[PDB]
Amino acid sequence: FGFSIVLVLGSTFVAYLPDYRMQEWARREAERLVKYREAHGLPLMESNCFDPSKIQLPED
Amino acid sequence: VVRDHWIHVLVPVGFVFGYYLDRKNDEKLAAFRNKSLLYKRELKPNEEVTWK
Amino acid sequence: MNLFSSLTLVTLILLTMPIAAINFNTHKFTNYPLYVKTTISCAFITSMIPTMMFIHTGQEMIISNWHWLTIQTLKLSLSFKMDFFSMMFVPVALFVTWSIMEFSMWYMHSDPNINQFFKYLLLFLITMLILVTANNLFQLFIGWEGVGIMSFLLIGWWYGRTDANTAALQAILYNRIGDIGFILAMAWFLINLNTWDLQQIFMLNPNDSNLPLMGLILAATGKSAQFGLHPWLPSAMEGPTPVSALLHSSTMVVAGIFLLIRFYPLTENNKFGQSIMLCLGAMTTLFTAMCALTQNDIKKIIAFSTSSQLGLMMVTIGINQPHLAFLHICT
Amino acid sequence: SHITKDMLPGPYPKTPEERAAAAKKYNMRVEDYEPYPDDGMGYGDYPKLPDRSQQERDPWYDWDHPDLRLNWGEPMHWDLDMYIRNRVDTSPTPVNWNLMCKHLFGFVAFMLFMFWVGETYPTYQPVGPKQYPYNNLYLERGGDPNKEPEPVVHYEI
Amino acid sequence: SWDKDVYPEPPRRTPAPSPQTSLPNPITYLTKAFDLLVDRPVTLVREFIERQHAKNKYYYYHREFRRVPDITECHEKDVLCMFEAEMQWKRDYKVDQEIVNIIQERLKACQQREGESHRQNCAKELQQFTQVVKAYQDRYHDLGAHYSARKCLAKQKQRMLAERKATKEAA
Amino acid sequence: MLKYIIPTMMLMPLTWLSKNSMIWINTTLHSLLISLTSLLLLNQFGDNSLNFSLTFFSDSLSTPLLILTMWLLPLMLMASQHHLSKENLARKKLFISMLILLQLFLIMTFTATELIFFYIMFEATLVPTLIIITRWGNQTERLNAGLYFLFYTLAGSLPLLVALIYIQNTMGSLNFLILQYWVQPMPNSWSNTFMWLACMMAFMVKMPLYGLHLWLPKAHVEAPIAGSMVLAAILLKLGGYGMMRITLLLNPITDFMAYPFIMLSLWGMIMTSSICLRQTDLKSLIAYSSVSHMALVIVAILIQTPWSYMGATALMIAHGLTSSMLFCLANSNYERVHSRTMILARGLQTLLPLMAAWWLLASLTNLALPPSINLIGELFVVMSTFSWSNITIILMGLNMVITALYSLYMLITTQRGKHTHHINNILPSFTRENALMSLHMLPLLLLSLNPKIILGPLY
Amino acid sequence: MTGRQARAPLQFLPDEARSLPPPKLTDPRLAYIGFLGYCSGLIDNAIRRRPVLSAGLHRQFLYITSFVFVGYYLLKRQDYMYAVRDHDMFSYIKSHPEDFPEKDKKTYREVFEEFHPVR
Amino acid sequence: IRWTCARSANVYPNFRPNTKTSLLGALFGIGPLIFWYYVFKTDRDRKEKLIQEGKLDRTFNISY
């Protein structure tokens, strides 16, 4: 009850489990997004992640 | 065998009771059932629930 | 080619079976030296073939899988490469160490703790192979400290004999000076070039190169017995004889300069760096030359001689000549 | 077990009483007991020893702790942990010490000065430049596929 | 399998060697015997296991999320807009890190394929790597540990304020 | 979480109405069942933290420390006999129940939503360890040890209460999301500097930093094994986790006001690695080793890089495992010979032939053998601090050299070279101590295989 | 805070405390009070040298019953006090709309907060 | 045991705070600390002024 049912079962439990920190989800999402943005002609990783039209700058 | 020894079976009873009490707590926290803007589908197709 | 990667990985994994075998043994198999000898001979005779294919065609290939903590904008997997140095050096080391297996069968016959000895020696062999195969610099650091601590255990093999554990403490302290130089190099590589790899660094040759090259110099003098950090050498001769043979023949004695042969596109430029290389090597070479005279032990003389040859290899890296230095390593 | 008066608070004064008590307690001769003294640095009243004691004590006496140089009743000098072999060789050096450091520092200074005289004075054979043909090997440097055409050629000599 | 449209692998280039020897060729018979000893039984065992797999069927689906409207249309304290906005932004941050990782893998592949001529047929991939990493260094770098979404917005506002001041002083 | 809490309450009368020669098996069995139950926690994913409803949540920082705690409990509960296995039945049940109640407040402290709940359970974590080490400290200065312990930790930890009630009554409630999502940057007044000094100084007491480090060593060398391992591992890394929580507020002032604490931490790391190179009293060397590693942790926390936080949590968990193991080895050596010193009981390579392998493996994971988690933590802390400043790497590697030096000196001093051949009483090793060794070093190497778990929230 | 109908004497629970819903059966706070009553009976059996967990069961039953009863009345008083505090607060908000204006909620597209990075 | 009791717990009694011990403590305890704090001030002033001028090599300097 300390090794034979705890240790190897914990090894098989932590060996695979859902996508921790959405890791391989982010892998496949990035693959689809890079293919998407290569197909639509625009460069990958559009800078200025927030919309530069969506700003109300304090004027001077 | 239960009355032969019952001391060894106490904490699984406690863990099942705590598990059921946390389920009852999440049923007590049953607001915002579908009112999000990211997880928003209708009740479908059978009966009026999406998580318990 | 599938045969090339397959035979290189089975040369790596033939150096895995005896350790797990006499971890899971529970029955004292008395032919375990014979077992270790025949699996090292089989590992060599499998290691000659992909080198023969390499010189036959070329086809210089890297393998990399089982990634772990791919956290920020880097990733790091178990990753090692088959190029000229990492393919030519390995059968020489297996052949030399197999001869040391024979001589350690004979010389260490009348001590009944021989199984622990051969376990430590094969584990050190594995670690030095891991050092000479890797391209990901974290795995180079793994091989670095692993060969340092297996060097510690094989120098301090004889408990008792305060010479031995004092000497081994000297060796491990100079190894940690090699560590601080190497992690300075690792820190500069990470923060300026987003990784610690051969491939991306040689892809983008930087301009500022004082700090990582000085870190390489400090790691090289921490491992390869150079001046100011040399005197752990008769210290290291105070251990057993085949321990000293493996410790200062091929393994653990070239890893200070094998790193400099590894980073030859980084030391193509920076004339100041090669001046430091050749001047420090000439200083080591003269001091070992003047010190090796008037000596009484055999082992201290042969160790000062191999330190002098390491000084010649540092001169060889001072000139833009990596491949002659590598050929001198083998011979 | 252990006596309360086999601890040792308080310094050396007075000269009859505490010196006699240290002779009785530290298992030593009366005049061989000497405190440091107390300059305000703690130390209790722990004795002064001949301070080297480890590359001394030649091993053919065959005392009771060979790698520890005990005798089970020795007062065990205050800097014992800095003294055992594997730490510091307090041997008589066969030559000197100051003469050794003068020789060594003179040698290191001479070699570094010859290195500096080399660093200001290079060596070179009668050898010209290596003639890289395609504009000092243009188009394979770190850029410029179309940016700067730089015409420079060698002449057949 | 995967998509070669998103992972560029340049086409194969293999010559036919020409002996000009009659010893001949130990490695050719060696690789034929290796194929005859290893390449056939691995294929047989894999075919057995492939029948045992594909007798029945499973499915994994690419988990997809919708689009939160804005953080810019969220209010002052008013939390339940900001939670959607910041978790959507954090998922964009994770997928942008994986964009950087995939482009770095492309750079490693271009290094390893092209031989010792490192500066041949890699200037465009190095150029797009420097472009995306210039965007990343500009956009996500100098904020530290406690990013939520608001520090990225503050950096964005201060940076376009600096750009406005620079072009107004340039005019 | 309450399903991970209420079987610990129901585990308390287990020890009471378990009869004689029966408490041991029942407590160990059911605490290992709790270890499986807490191994079932790990579900946390992607965007948010995992809420265990309104009272509770967990980041991916509290989760490995919590699983570490409930794994460390049966190890301790088997560790803590042979010095009280001959004492009374009622006092034995009281000891074991006090350990269980201590675990309960540890889990209460790690799983906190509000910092007031965190502070109450923080000094609730404080109070039982006092009683345990004072009652079974087994040396003539355990009184002074527990006294300095409670007075330093309360007298430092007290203005944290005033500052947290202040943040309560000026900026809404104290959810970590609502301490987050709403915190305005508080500018450089002097009152902001005093409040930052209060919170950070309270946890500086708990780490300890260098100016308050003599808190520790008496409370280890004059304390039994249970309170020692709980103290070192869970209390020091609990203080570290508390600062990792509370450092989210007060960002524009910690840059200007956090220079001297980095300084005292670095210079004390160097001087503490120097101080534990020469001492006797073998138990204390691991205590100053812990002071050195926690000064490294404090450098890592007060610089504010995600690399630094990942290295911080790795160094926390790996050093907790290593220090708990090495304390258990020093306990085994003291149960062999009743001396506690260092130069006396040498030898032990001939005798206890496989205990040497555990001394070797503990000293090499203390050496930062490079696939282990300890070097992962130390390495990413060195990377982040070289990004912080270009000259601090000399102090880091100097710590590294002297750390290797004193750890391997500990290895080749007590267990290398010569039995003094007047000892003549020690018996060969029991299966219990080797079982505790296999409880120690299998999770460390399994985390060395799969280390994507223990890295922090900024993964 | 002060009465709020101290005129109108002390009145341990007013009649308006029947308008709020009562504390239900097996609410957790009164269950904790019952556990404390059981522990009080156990420590009463522990003061005198009688065997614990036995030979005091009528005292156990009496202590648990009395403490649950008193805790029920105290919970009813607590609920009334918090309810009347909320009613007084919202009535004072309704009585003076001039004194407490609401903030003009400017969105994050036009909130200027300076940055001050960490390095 | 006499050596251990002299070396561990007989340090703090006996003691008197003198001029020599105070000067040596303030020379070894706050001296090198204010030395390293001055040089960290120097290096941080240089880095702050340089990256405020913007003439740093951060074409790609990601892993901060």
The CA dihedral of C152, C157, C160, C164, to the nearest 10 degrees, is -40
Distance to chain H for F142, nearest Cα, Å? 13
Strand-pair partners of D40? none
CB burial of residue F171 (10 Å; 0-12, 13-18, 19+): middle
How near does any CA of chain G get to the CA of A25, in Å?
A: 30
Distance CA G55, CA F368 (A): 60
Tokens of A48: 């200025």
Residues C194 and H62: beta-carbon distance below 8 Å:
yes
Q: Name the residue among F10, F6, F11, F9 with its Cα closest to residue F52.
A: F6
Contact D56, D90 (CB under 8 A): yes
> Residues 264 to 283 of C: which have CB under 8 A from any D CB?
275, 279, 283
DSSP H or E run through C64: strand C61-65
Whether F61 contacts F457, CB under 8 Å: yes
CA distance F161 to F157: 8
**With contacts defined as CB-CB under 8 Å, which chain D residues touch E117?**
140
Q: Does the beta carbon of H60 lie under 8 angstroms from any beta carbon of chain G?
A: no
D6 to C11, D24, H4: CA distances (angstroms):
66, 10, 12
Q: How far apart are CA F361 and CA F438, in angstroms?
A: 11
Nearest to B14 among F7, F17, F26 (CB): F7
| CA–CA dist F73, F102 (Å, integer) | 10
One-letter identity of residue E35: D
Please answer whether residues F131 and F150 qualify as being in contact, where contact means their C-beta atoms are separated by less than 8 angstroms: no
Strands F50-52 and C78-82 turn out to be unpaired
F417/C162 CB distance under 8 A:
yes
Report whether E127 contacts G86 (CB < 8 A).
Answer: no
For an interface test with F, the pick among D81, D82, D85, D88 (most F C-beta atoms closer than 10 Å) comes out as: D81
Query: Would you kindly state where each structural domain of chain B is located, as residue ranges?
Result: 1-51
**Secondary structure tally for chain C: helices H, strands E:** 15, 2
Compare all CA atoms of chain A with the CA of G109 and give the residue at the minimum distance.
Answer: A55
Residue H4 to residue F267, Cβ atoms within 8 A? no
Q: What are the chain F neighbours of B17 within 8 Å (beta carbons)?
A: 6
Do residues G107 and E73 lie in contact, with contact meaning Cβ atoms separated by under 8 Å? Answer: yes
D67–F417 CB contact, under 8 Å = yes
Measured distance CA(D42)–CA(D25) in Å, rounded: 19
Which F-chain residues 14-53 have CB contacts (< 8 A) with chain B?
14, 17-18, 22, 26, 29-30, 33-34, 37, 52-53
Whether A and H touch, i.e. at least 3 CB pairs below 8 A, reads as no
Q: How far apart are the CA of E116 and the nearest CA of chain B, in angstroms?
A: 50
CB pairs under 8 A between D and F: 18
Helix/strand/coil for G108: coil
Question: What experimental approach yielded this model?
Answer: cryo-EM
Give one DSSP letter per residue of chain D, joined into a string: ---GGGS--S-S-STTHHHHHHHHHTT--TTT------SSS--TTPPP--S--SSSS-TTS--SBTTTTB-SSS---TTGGGTSTTT---PPPSS-SHHHHHHHHHHHHHHHHHHHHHHHS----S------TTTTTTTSSSS-SSS----------
> Where do the domains of chain F lie?
1-459
In chain D, residues with a C-beta closer than 8 Å to the C-beta of F346 are 67-68
> For residues E2 and A31, what is the distance between their CA atoms, to the nearest angstrom?
10
Provide the phi-psi class of G21: left if phi over 0, else alpha when psi is between -120 and 50, else beta: beta
Q: What spatial distance separates the first Cα and last Cα of chain B, rounded to whole Å? A: 35
Contact E144 G111 (CB under 8 A): no
Return the SS3 of C60: coil
Categorise residue F342: left if φ over 0, alpha if ψ from -120 to 50, beta otherwise: alpha
Cα separation, F54 vs F112, whole angstroms: 10
- From first CA to last CA, the distance across chain G in angstroms is 49
Residue F351, phi-psi category: left (phi > 0), alpha (psi -120 to 50), beta (remainder): beta
Evaluate whether F96 touches F88 at the Cβ level (below 8 Å): no
Report d(CA F417, CA F410) in Å as an integer. Answer: 13
Q: Would an 8 Å CB–CB cutoff place B10 in contact with chain E? A: no
Distance in angstroms (rounded) separating the CA atoms of residues F440 and F157: 32
> Under a CB-based contact definition with an 8 Å cutoff, are residues F285 and F232 in contact?
no
Contact of C9 with chain E, judged by CB distance below 8 Å, is answered with no
Query: How many contacts does B have with F, using Cβ atoms within 8 A?
Result: 52
Alpha-carbon torsion, ordered C289, C295, C299, C305, to 10 deg = 10
Q: What residues have CB less than 8 Å from D3, skipping those under 6 apart?
A: none
Q: Which amino acid is at G6?
A: A
Inter-chain residue contact H64 with C191, CB threshold 8 Å:
yes
Cα dihedral F324→F325→F331→F335 (10° resolution): 150
Q: Is there a contact between A21 and F438 if contact means CB atoms under 8 Å apart?
A: no
